[PDB]
């Protein structure tokens, strides 16, 4: 019986209080939506890597557990047992019963004891680094679907191996896995939600952005799908075993005075072949194999047991001082063993004539006491000269695994990867192969001599297309540079969880030049790009599902080209369009000492040795801060005179109320300016802070925002002066003294500029004025109800705030030190090591500040380019009429109006758009009296029978007289000259 775990099993990872924060933690967690074995009421289940155990009951029938490996009396086991008023925890060699519920027979050799004191009771049991950790939670309740974090209960220093466990009596058992979880802490203080990063692609995206809400778009994720790897060692087939068989089975050994010395070298010395026949000094027997030496000097001889002690470093007996003097310090392995049944001659073995003074004889019998009996000794002296080592142990080797992420060691070259055979052809002597990066990519197997091509496992992160967590939780996954037959092999979609394998196949699979897209249905309809996938493919949320499609460039439109047809506009539109340009960015100041060495004086005195780094940073940021005011001045302080509009606001029916200053408000901002001011949200604004949220955090870390020199009111005054100058004097105030001119007359000048006669404006004055008024009203309306029209200015603000928050968060990095707190380093370590740690921290934080400043300089160069463009627009669109195509709006530019926006400028471009075109026949020239006539300022058009001359941008046909054409040549050259009459007046 199995059930769904949902999101149960989260526990507090550490003992630190946190509030209103998202914290990532890599630990052992019960994965979300896991399979829990449900037992109703007591089998022995495995422990694996920790267990989650829930109990829904009302009677307290489940009140304990046993943990262990064999659960017999030959191994230590742990027993937790709740009773009427206490919990008893014991670690002993229990002999547990067949069905414990009296739970054990024997309790010998205890090690540890500890006594302390519909409902759902949840526990988490972990066994790490010798400590049994227990977390718990109790609620009053399938298993519920709420979120409830388990609090730590106890860490017990049990120090045993646990593989299986049993319950002492519904109850549910789940298994912890190594996972990263993103935890959300509340403000009143609590873990209230979590994300399982390995659950599925959306969870991977959430853990990559460290947020619980994702906006619409495509995100590159980091790999949170962790796979296990096994180890394989491959060394050369050993061969060439050292001649140790001759020193441990030779028939007759030497005599201690005439002791032998062999020079075993250039071979493999299996010392493990002993233990079947061992005091080692300056070395341990277990490391002998993985060590190497120049030449092991194997001396051999025979003595009596009483003298074996003399063969050792530091002894000074008779043998140690008169026969074989072994140094007080040396490395080697004295291997002695009784060989009485190999060296006891009857009547006396006078073959081991030992020195005492000159030299007497041992003379063993086969009846001597244990005492003085034949004892063979092999002193295996070792060497470590600088000359190359040539004596080494066997160097065992594992089997070879293929097509699995593995930790390999080929003859001393170590690395992680997947081995997949190869086609590469090494030269016979070549052992490894390297790629462009100068990193190993192929290895020849030392034993089989075949060549294996090493490839990475886990091609990394994927791209996740989301419509936004607010809208839906459906996502698509793009695997970059992969075809949709290798996706399951690429992501290893057999070791992945379910709800991840759903994104490896499923017939919702589409191939693109960017890779394989799974989870979206490719439609053949083409729309505008919503989420860009690449190579022409975009994605959108249909409504209901995610659809992929080829991007549409726009509506096709064939133009009716002809050798004699001309389309001329008969009407026009006055269009008002916006253009938002950033001008300045937040001015920032950093207290270098406060950021790097916060509240630590030793850190400050050390920081005094890193040169002028802080001075250079301060100089760079001051340059940026001054450049921001220079940008604002160059954009808005063009006019030196503060012009004012007349008290009467009649301008030929043109209504500027929406752009002109409004006295019914303290700021004197215009209505559109007020709307813009309330559409961009500032973070700090640089104004007085009175001692007593994120701004406070930044300020405490030494990061401040300085106010701009010009206030919003002064920028609004500059804008109002520009507006008054242009309304009352046209473009004259930009070139010299402001020359008054009535607004309809100025508008006639601007119509002349774009090449339409003045009458067109004087005869359509009311229509033009109403079109302009309606366009301005539409500008206001599509601003009061527009989602993000000021997205560029808000982007400037958000970028600055995000950089500052990144700086604050980078203070939690240790950069390889013991802690990120300087005070702890100084309070725990002495100067000799504190210097290393503090140098690490100071260098890391200096690098973080330098990175911040470099990014600020680059962004300031971008903002300065934008401010220069804004100043050029102000000069050429507001202070004049521009002939440059698309510089001051789409269409023939008439005029422009500036409006101050919090960190930038908005230009309202008024342009003239021809409309309601009509086809006409046209000719290059008109033949008359044998003379060719060309239009002075116009084009010849025909209504079908009659010929007129018209201005090009507005249909105003005129009789073709001699005062609107000019004569040049005869009618025998111009290709298309038409025959008609010129009315010579």
* Structure tokens belonging to residue 195: 């994300």
| Contact partner, 655, from ligand NAG, a second copy, none, Cβ < 5-8 Å per class | ligand NAG
Q: At closest approach, how far in Å is the CB of 259 from a second copy?
A: 49
| Contact partner, 277, from ligand NAG, a second copy, none, Cβ < 5-8 Å per class | none
Q: Any idea what DSSP says for residue 878?
A: I
Q: Percent helix, strand and coil across the chain, each rounded to 5?
A: 25, 30, 45
Sole binder of a second copy in the list 447, 593, 921, 942 (CB under 8 A): 593
Residue 222 in the binding site for a second copy (CB under 8 A): yes
| Contact partner, 975, from ligand NAG, a second copy, none, Cβ < 5-8 Å per class | none
Instruction: Give the nearer residue to a second copy in terms of CB position, either 589 or 942.
Output: 589
In DSSP notation, 462-513 reads -EEEES-TTT-S--EEEEET--TTTHHHHTTTTTSPTTTGGGT-SS-EEEET
Instruction: Give the nearer residue to ligand NAG in terms of CB position, either 852 or 920.
Output: 920
Sole binder of a second copy in the list 610, 643, 826, 887 (CB under 8 A): 610
Instruction: Give the nearer residue to ligand NAG in terms of CB position, either 693 or 830.
Output: 693
| Contact partner, 934, from a second copy, ligand NAG, none, Cβ < 5-8 Å per class | none
Residue 590 in the binding site for a second copy (CB under 8 A): yes
* Structure tokens belonging to residue 560: 């009716």
**Residues between 407 and 446 with contacts to a second copy, criterion CB under 8 A:** 415-417, 435-437, 439, 441
Q: Count Cβ atoms below 10 Å from residue 80 Cβ, excluding itself.
A: 22
Sole binder of ligand NAG in the list 228, 663, 944, 985 (CB under 6 A): 944
From the list 145-153, 322-330, 339-347, 592-600, the region that binds a second copy by CB under 8 A is 592-600
In which order are the strands placed within the sheet that holds 515-518? 217-220, 463-466, 476-480, 515-518, 509-512
Euclidean distance between the first and the last CA atom of the chain, given in angstroms as a whole number:
108
Q: At closest approach, how far in Å is the CB of 924 from a second copy?
A: 34
| Contact partner, 609, from ligand NAG, a second copy, none, Cβ < 5-8 Å per class | a second copy
Sole binder of a second copy in the list 243, 481, 506, 969 (CB under 8 A): 481
Q: How far apart are CA 40 and CA 877, in angstroms?
A: 81
From the list 597-605, 782-790, 849-857, 940-948, the region that binds ligand NAG by CB under 6 A is 940-948
CA distances from 392 to 385, 512, 708 (A): 14, 56, 74
Longest dimension (CA), the chain: 164
645 and 724 in contact (C-beta within 8 Å)? Answer: yes
Sole binder of ligand NAG in the list 657, 786, 819, 970 (CB under 6 A): 657
The distance from CA 198 to its chain's CA centroid, rounded to whole angstroms, is 15
Q: Count Cβ atoms below 10 Å from residue 21 Cβ, excluding itself.
A: 11
**Residues between 760 and 779 with contacts to ligand NAG, criterion CB under 6 A:** 777
Instruction: Give the nearer residue to ligand NAG in terms of CB position, either 130 or 236.
Output: 236
| Contact partner, 57, from ligand NAG, a second copy, none, Cβ < 5-8 Å per class | none
Q: At closest approach, how far in Å is the CB of 472 from ligand NAG?
A: 22
In DSSP notation, 333-354 reads EEEEEE-HHHH--TT-BTT---
Q: Count Cβ atoms below 10 Å from residue 857 Cβ, excluding itself.
A: 15
Instruction: Give the nearer residue to ligand NAG in terms of CB position, either 665 or 946.
Output: 946
Q: Any idea what DSSP says for residue 359?
A: B
678 and 783 in contact (C-beta within 8 Å)? Answer: no
**Residues between 109 and 138 with contacts to a second copy, criterion CB under 8 A:** none
**Residues between 807 and 836 with contacts to a second copy, criterion CB under 8 A:** 809-810, 813-816
Give the residue from 352, 258, 260, 345 showing the smallest Cα distance to 303.
352
Residue 509 has phi, psi (to 5 degrees) of -125, 130
**Residues between 918 and 957 with contacts to a second copy, criterion CB under 8 A:** none
Q: At closest approach, how far in Å is the CB of 180 from a second copy?
A: 9
Lookup result for tokens 């406060």: 594
Q: CB-based contacts of 205: which residues, under 8 Å, 6+ apart?
A: 214, 219, 221, 464, 466, 475
Q: At closest approach, how far in Å is the CB of 647 from a second copy?
A: 49
Lookup result for tokens 């813009």: 676
Helix (H) or strand (E) holding 727: helix 712-729
Give the residue from 245, 276, 287 showing the smallest Cα distance to 262.
245
Lookup result for tokens 């990475």: 456
Instruction: Give the nearer residue to ligand NAG in terms of CB position, either 119 or 657.
Output: 657
Residue 116 burial (C-beta neighbours within 10 Å; 0-12, 13-18, 19+): exposed
Give the residue from 192, 193, 198 showing the smallest Cα distance to 31.
198
Sole binder of a second copy in the list 709, 775, 783, 821 (CB under 8 A): 709
| Contact partner, 205, from ligand NAG, a second copy, none, Cβ < 5-8 Å per class | none
Q: Any idea what DSSP says for residue 15?
A: S
**Residues between 343 and 362 with contacts to ligand NAG, criterion CB under 6 A:** none
Q: At closest approach, how far in Å is the CB of 182 from ligand NAG?
A: 19
From the list 289-297, 436-444, 567-575, 893-901, the region that binds ligand NAG by CB under 6 A is 567-575
Angle at 303 between CA 299 and CA 304, to 5 degrees: 155
**Residues between 529 and 558 with contacts to a second copy, criterion CB under 8 A:** 529, 532, 534-536, 551, 553
Residue 104 in the binding site for a second copy (CB under 8 A): no
Residue 943 in the binding site for ligand NAG (CB under 6 A): yes
Beta-bridged to residue 297, according to DSSP, are 263, 381
Residue 977 burial (C-beta neighbours within 10 Å; 0-12, 13-18, 19+): buried
Residue 236 in the binding site for ligand NAG (CB under 6 A): yes
Q: How many residues does the chain have?
A: 985
Lookup result for tokens 């006639």: 748
Sole binder of a second copy in the list 14, 142, 421, 599 (CB under 8 A): 599
| Contact partner, 598, from a second copy, ligand NAG, none, Cβ < 5-8 Å per class | a second copy
**Number of chain positions touching ligand NAG (CB under 6 A):** 34
| Contact partner, 447, from ligand NAG, a second copy, none, Cβ < 5-8 Å per class | ligand NAG
Sole binder of ligand NAG in the list 109, 403, 448, 616 (CB under 6 A): 448
**Residues between 9 and 28 with contacts to a second copy, criterion CB under 8 A:** 26
| Contact partner, 162, from a second copy, ligand NAG, none, Cβ < 5-8 Å per class | none
Q: Which residues bind ligand NAG (CB under 6 A)?
A: 2, 33-35, 187-188, 236-237, 447-448, 483, 485, 497-498, 560, 562-563, 567, 570-571, 655, 657-658, 777, 917-919, 927, 943-946, 957, 979
């Amino acid at each position: 019986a199995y059930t769904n775990s949902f999101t149960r099993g989260v526990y507090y990872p550490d003992k630190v209080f946190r509030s209103s924060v998202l914290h990532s933690t890599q630990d052992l967690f019960l994965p979300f939506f896991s399979n829990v074995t449900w037992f109703h009421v007591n089998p022995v289940l495995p422990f694996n890597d920790g267990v989650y155990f829930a109990s829904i009951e009302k009677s307290n029938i489940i009140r304990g557990w046993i943990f262990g490996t064999t659960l017999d009396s030959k191994t230590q086991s742990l027993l937790i047992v709740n009773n009427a008023t206490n919990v008893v925890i014991k670690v002993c060699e229990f002999q547990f019963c067949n069905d414990p519920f009296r739970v054990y027979s024997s309790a010998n050799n205890c090690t540890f004891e500890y006594v302390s004191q519909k409902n759902l009771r949840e526990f988490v049991f972990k066994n790490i680094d010798g400590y049994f950790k227990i977390y718990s939670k109790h609620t009053p309740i399938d298993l519920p679907q709420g979120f409830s974090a388990l609090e730590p209960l106890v860490d017990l220093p049990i120090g045993i191996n646990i593989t299986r466990f049993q319950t002492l009596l519904a109850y549910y058992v789940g298994y912890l896995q190594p996972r990263t979880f993103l935890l959300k802490y509340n403000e009143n203080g609590t873990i209230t939600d979590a994300v399982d990063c390995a659950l599925d692609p959306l969870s991977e995206t959430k853990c990559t952005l460290k947020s619980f809400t994702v906006e619409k778009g495509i995100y590159q994720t980091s790999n949170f799908r962790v796979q296990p790897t096994e180890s394989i060692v491959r060394f050369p087939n050993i061969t060439n075993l050292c001649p140790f068989d001759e020193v441990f089975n030779a028939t007759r050994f030497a005599s201690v005075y005439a002791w032998n010395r062999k020079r075993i070298s250039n071979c493999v010395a299996d010392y493990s072949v002993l233990y079947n026949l061992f005091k080692c000094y300056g070395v341990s027997p277990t490391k002998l194999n993985d060590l190497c030496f120049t030449n092991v000097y194997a001396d051999s001889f025979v003595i009596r047991g009483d003298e074996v002690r003399q063969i050792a470093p530091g002894q000074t007996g008779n043998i140690a001082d008169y026969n074989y003097k072994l140094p007080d310090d040396f490395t080697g392995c004295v291997i002695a063993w009784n060989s009485n049944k190999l060296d006891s001659k009857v009547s006396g073995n006078y073959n081991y004539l030992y020195r005492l003074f000159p030299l007497r004889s041992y003379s063993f019998r086969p009846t001597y006491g244990v005492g003085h009996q034949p004892y063979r000794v092999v002193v295996l002296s070792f060497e470590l000269l600088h000359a190359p080592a040539t004596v080494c142990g066997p160097k065992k080797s594992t089997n070879l695994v293929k097509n699995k992420c593995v930790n390999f060691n080929f003859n001393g070259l170590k690395g992680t990867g997947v081995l997949t055979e190869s086609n590469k052809k090494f030269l016979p002597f070549q052992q490894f192969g390297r790629d462009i990066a100068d990193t190993t990519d192929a290895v020849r197997d030392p034993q089989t001599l075949e060549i294996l091509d090493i490839t990475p496992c886990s091609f990394g992160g994927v791209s996740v297309i989301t419509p936004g967590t607010n809208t839906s939780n459906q996502v698509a996954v793009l695997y970059q540079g992969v075809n949709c037959t290798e996706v399951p092999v690429a992501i290893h979609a057999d070791q992945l969880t379910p709800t991840w394998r759903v994104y490896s196949t499923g017939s919702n699979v589409f191939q693109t030049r960017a890779g394989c897209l799974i989870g979206a249905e490719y439609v053949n309809n083409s729309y505008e790009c919503d989420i860009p996938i690449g190579a022409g493919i975009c994605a959108s949320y249909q409504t209901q599902s995610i659809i992929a499609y080829t991007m549409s460039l726009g509506a096709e439109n064939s133009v009716a080209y002809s050798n004699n047809s001309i389309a001329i506009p008969t009407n026009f539109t006055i269009s008002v369009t916006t253009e938002i340009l950033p001008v300045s960015m937040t001015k920032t100041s950093v207290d270098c000492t406060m950021y790097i060495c916060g509240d630590s004086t030793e850190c400050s005195n050390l920081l005094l040795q890193y040169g002028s780094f802080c001075t250079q940073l301060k100089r760079a940021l001051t340059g940026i801060a001054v450049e921001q005011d220079k940008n604002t001045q160059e954009v808005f302080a063009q006019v030196k005179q503060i012009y004012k509009t007349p008290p009467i606001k009649y301008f030929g029916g043109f209504n500027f109320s929406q752009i002109l200053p409004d006295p019914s408000k303290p700021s004197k901002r215009s209505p559109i300016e007020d709307l813009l001011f309330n559409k961009v949200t500032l973070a700090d604004a640089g104004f007085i802070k009175q001692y007593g949220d994120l701004i406070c955090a930044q300020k405490f870390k030494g990061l401040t925002v300085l106010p701009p020199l010009l206030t919003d009111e002064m920028i609004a005054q500059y804008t109002s002066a520009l507006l008054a100058g242009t309304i009352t004097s046209g473009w004259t105030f930009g070139a010299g003294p402001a020359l008054q001119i009535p607004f309809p007359m100025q508008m006639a000048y601007r119509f002349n500029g774009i090449g339409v006669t003045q009458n067109v404006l004087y005869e359509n004055q009311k229509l033009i004025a109403n079109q302009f008024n309606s366009a301005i009203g539409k500008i206001q309306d599509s601003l009061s109800s527009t989602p993000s029209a000021l997205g560029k200015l808000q982007d400037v603000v958000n970028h600055n705030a995000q950089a500052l928050n990144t700086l604050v968060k980078q203070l939690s990095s240790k950069f390889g030190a013991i802690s990120s707190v300087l005070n702890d380093i100084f309070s725990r370590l002495d100067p000799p090591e504190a210097e290393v740690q503090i140098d690490r921290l100071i260098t890391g934080r200096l690098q973080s500040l330098q990175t911040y400043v470099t990014q600020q300089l680059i962004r300031a160069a971008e903002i300065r380019a934008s401010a220069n463009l804004a100043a050029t627009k102000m000069s050429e669109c507001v202070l004049g009429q521009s002939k440059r195509v698309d510089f001051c709006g789409k269409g023939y530019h008439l005029m422009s109006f500036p409006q101050s926006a919090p960190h930038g400028v908005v230009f309202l471009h008024v342009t003239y758009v021809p409309a309601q075109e009509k086809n006409f026949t046209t000719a290059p020239a008109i033949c008359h009296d044998g003379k060719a006539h060309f239009p002075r300022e116009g084009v010849f058009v025909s209504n079908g029978t009659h010929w007129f001359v018209t201005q090009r941008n507005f249909y105003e046909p005129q009789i073709i007289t001699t005062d609107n054409t000019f004569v040049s040549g005869n009618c025998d050259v111009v290709i298309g000259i038409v025959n008609n009459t010129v009315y010579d007046p």
